[PDB]
Structures are given as structure tokens and as C-alpha cells.
């Protein structure tokens, strides 16, 4: 759009894209996402990271040169004793060990330093926990936004909300670093993080500006999986209602149950939450180039039983609201896709394009209820029709 600085990974190589004139490189070994080739990794214990080396344009040293950056990051659970009060670096712009700024991690926080040549520094921190049932920020992509007014604040927002702010009046000259260095230094602990579209900006971005780089740089088309990577097909997944959180889904007879709780997973003083890895698992099919999963996509959901797959039918012979999910051994029915943010809905509808209704619950059991087409509830997560898919991985290990 207008950034001083994009940094995207294009045909096997990081680039600047603003073509304002960055170079980057690359050092040992960093993982490149294959869903998503904007998606990188850098690790703690052996050589791996990325280098931006500055314009010199945009190498700011004056004491009046509002900027900000924006990135997504995404940090595995903590599960170390090693882990708990060990602040590491993870992007570096700081000059001679003295003026510039850094984003570092430690447990439960993401840190920002931004410290002119005579030393005086702010600091701002984001503050999140492991001794919760369900977290939004977890082993999840968090997008950070860091602006800076150096005649007013400077401020954290995360997915797209204000967390902080400070005044930034005690500093006077910042002369960033030549360059930025996206490497894990200070880590005690065999660790790696995820990064995806950083860029800077030689302005203070706005509220409005940020809340649109949040819902348009992950391609707004394609729902999103539990950890906001790409939701896909054929891919086995474990399944979360976001208004019954606590709660397994489970096979019954040919019904699926939502009464059983899902149990908690800890491990003393790193963490405590609500087990992610229960109940039955899921698979979606296709109704043509790629696995991606977007809005408006016609599929089937179907259970995967010690290896045989259950198509979800809506039983619409009951006559009420609510038609209850049965399981049929793989039709008659199709479920439109979409998502409302990183929320998943599945619209159950005949052959002919009627509305059956969309996925949710009633009571005990899974059903597809017109009565959501009316009555959702418009800025949260709480609907019984919302849905997230689970798919076990190494950011995140359970009992």
C-alpha cells in the first residue's frame, strides 16, 4: 500500500516488495510453511535467520520520524521449567547495543524497546497467559502493530486492539540499527518462532489502518484452521464449539453428543488448559488446484471411525428448527463453508439450494438449526454455530 518496507518470500528468497530498495538474506537454516510460503521459522540452537539490510532511506536517526511495524507471530506453547523468566530477542534494529528498537519474548509476554543514543528508553508489553481453559494467543498467529508519534505515544496493538501506550517525550535522538535481524538470540531453550509479513512504515498508522492490514493479509477468502493457518481438506481435524468450549464432541449411536467434557491438560507452574486433542475427528471433501477451504465452498464433513469416514446428515424428517446430525457411512445434502473472521460455520442445505440450517447444538447433540440464520450475535465468538478445527501439532503437545 504505502509501507517503506515489505517483506515478502517469493521464489525461494526473501524480498523487499515495496520497491523501496531493502536487500535481505538468509543464514543456516530457516523452515518456509508449504501452505503458505509467507510463513518462516527461525530457531534458537543452530545457525538460521533472516536479514534485512536497511535502505539507507529509511536508517532514521533524527529525533521526529514517526514509524511503525507490523508483523504476525506465532510461539508454541511453553512447556520448560528452562522457559519461565528467560527474555530472548527475536527481531533486532538496535544500533551498537545502544539506540534503536527490538521486539524480544519471554513466558507469557511479547516485548517492545524502543531507546535513543543517550540511553533513555520506552518500554511496551503485551501480557497473555498459560493457565487459561482456551487462548487466543497460544501457538497462534498474533498480529503485533508497533506505532510510534515521537511528539505524543508509542503503541502495541494486538490483533488489531490497543494494549498499551507510553509517551515517548523522554526520547531524543533514535538512530536505528543498519539493519534488522529476524534471529532468536538470549534463549535458554531449544525454541523456534513463527514470522509473516513484516513491514515498516515512515508514519504512525491509525486504528483503521491497522485493523485493516489485520483482516487482509492472510487471504480474507480462505477460512482459517484453531491455530489461524489455513484451513484444508482432506486433512484430519478435531473439533471446538466456540460457545461450548469445555465440551467434547462424541459419537454416540449414529449422533454426535456435546455433554462430555473435554478434560484439562497441565504440567505445574508452565500451564493449564482445557485438553485441545479429544473427540472424534473430522475430515472435509470437496463437493480443484489446491486443498484451500473458502468461503462459500460446497462440502461434505465427514467423521473418521478407526479409519472408516461418517458423512454428517441432518435429519430432516423432524419437522422442527432443529434437525439432529446422524452419521452415515459414506448423498442427499450439501454444507456451504464460509467464516466470520476466524470463526467456521457449515450451512446445511438440501440439493435444490434450500436452507436446511447451520451447524450447531441443541441440547446434548449436534444439530443444523435454521433459528442461527437470525441470531447470531455480532462481535464475538459465543454462537453455538461457530466452529474451529483442531489439528494436532508440534506447536502444541498434550497428555
Not at 44 to 65: F, L
Not at 143 to 152: E, M, S
Not at 196 to 219: A, N
Request: glycine fraction near 6%; include cysteine; charged fraction near 20%.
Amino acid at each position: 500500500d504505502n509501507s517503506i518496507l515489505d517483506m515478502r518470500y517469493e521464489n525461494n528468497k526473501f524480498i523487499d516488495i515495496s520497491g523501496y530498495g531493502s536487500n535481505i538474506s538468509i543464514n543456516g537454516d530457516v523452515y518456509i510453511y508449504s501452505t503458505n510460503r509467507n510463513q518462516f521459522g527461525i530457531y534458537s540452537s543452530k545457525p538460521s535467520e533472516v536479514n534485512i539490510a536497511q535502505n539507507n532511506d529509511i536508517i532514521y536517526n533524527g529525533r521526529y520520524q514517526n514509524f511503525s511495524i507490523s508483523f504476525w507471530v506465532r510461539i508454541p506453547k511453553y512447556f520448560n521449567k528452562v522457559n519461565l523468566n528467560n527474555e530472548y530477542t527475536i527481531i533486532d534494529c538496535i544500533r551498537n547495543n545502544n539506540s534503536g528498537w527490538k521486539i524480544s519474548l519471554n513466558y507469557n509476554k511479547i516485548i517492545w524497546t524502543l531507546q535513543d543514543t543517550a540511553g533513555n528508553n520506552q518500554k511496551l508489553v503485551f501480557n497473555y497467559t498459560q493457565m487459561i481453559s482456551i487462548s487466543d494467543y497460544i501457538n497462534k498467529w498474533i498480529f503485533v502493530t508497533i506505532t510510534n508519534n515521537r511528539l505524543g505515544n508509542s503503541r502495541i496493538y494486538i490483533n488489531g486492539n490497543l494494549i498499551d501506550e507510553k509517551s515517548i517525550s523522554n526520547l531524543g535522538d533514535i538512530h536505528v540499527s543498519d539493519n534488522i535481524l529476524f534471529k532468536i538470540v538470549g534463549c535458554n531453550d531449544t525454541r523456534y518462532v513463527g514470522i509473516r509479513y513484516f513491514k515498516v512504515f515512515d508514519t504512525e498508522l491509525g486504528k483503521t489502518e491497522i485493523e485493516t492490514l489485520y483482516s487482509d493479509e492472510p487471504d480474507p477468502s480462505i477460512l482459517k484452521d484453531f491455530w489461524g493457518n489455513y484451513l484444508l481438506y482432506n486433512k484430519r481435524y478435531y473439533l471446538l464449539n466456540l460457545l461450548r468450549t469445555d465440551k467434547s464432541i462424541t459419537q454416540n449411536s449414529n449422533f454426535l453428543n456435546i455433554n462430555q467434557q473435554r478434560g484439562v491438560y497441565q504440567k505445574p507452574n508452565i500451564f493449564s488448559n482445557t485438553r485441545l486433542y479429544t473427540g472424534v475427528e473430522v475430515i472435509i471433501r470437496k463437493n480443484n488446484t489446491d486443498n484451500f477451504v473458502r468461503k462459500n465452498d460446497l462440502a461434505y464433513i465427514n467423521v473418521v471411525d478407526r479409519d472408516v469416514e461418517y458423512r454428517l446428515y441432518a435429519d430432516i424428517s423432524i419437522a422442527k428448527p432443529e434437525k439432529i446430525i446422524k452419521l452415515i457411512r459414506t448423498l442427499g445434502q450439501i454444507i456451504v463453508m464460509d467464516s466470520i473472521g476466524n470463526n467456521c460455520t457449515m450451512n446445511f442445505q438440501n440439493n435444490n439450494g434450500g436452507n436446511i440450517g447451520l451447524l450447531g447444538f441443541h441440547s446434548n447433540n449436534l444439530v443444523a438449526s435454521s433459528w442461527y440464520y437470525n441470531n447470531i450475535r455480532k462481535n464475538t465468538s459465543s454462537n453455538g454455530c461457530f466452529w474451529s478445527f483442531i489439528s494436532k501439532e508440534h506447536g502444541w503437545q498434550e497428555n
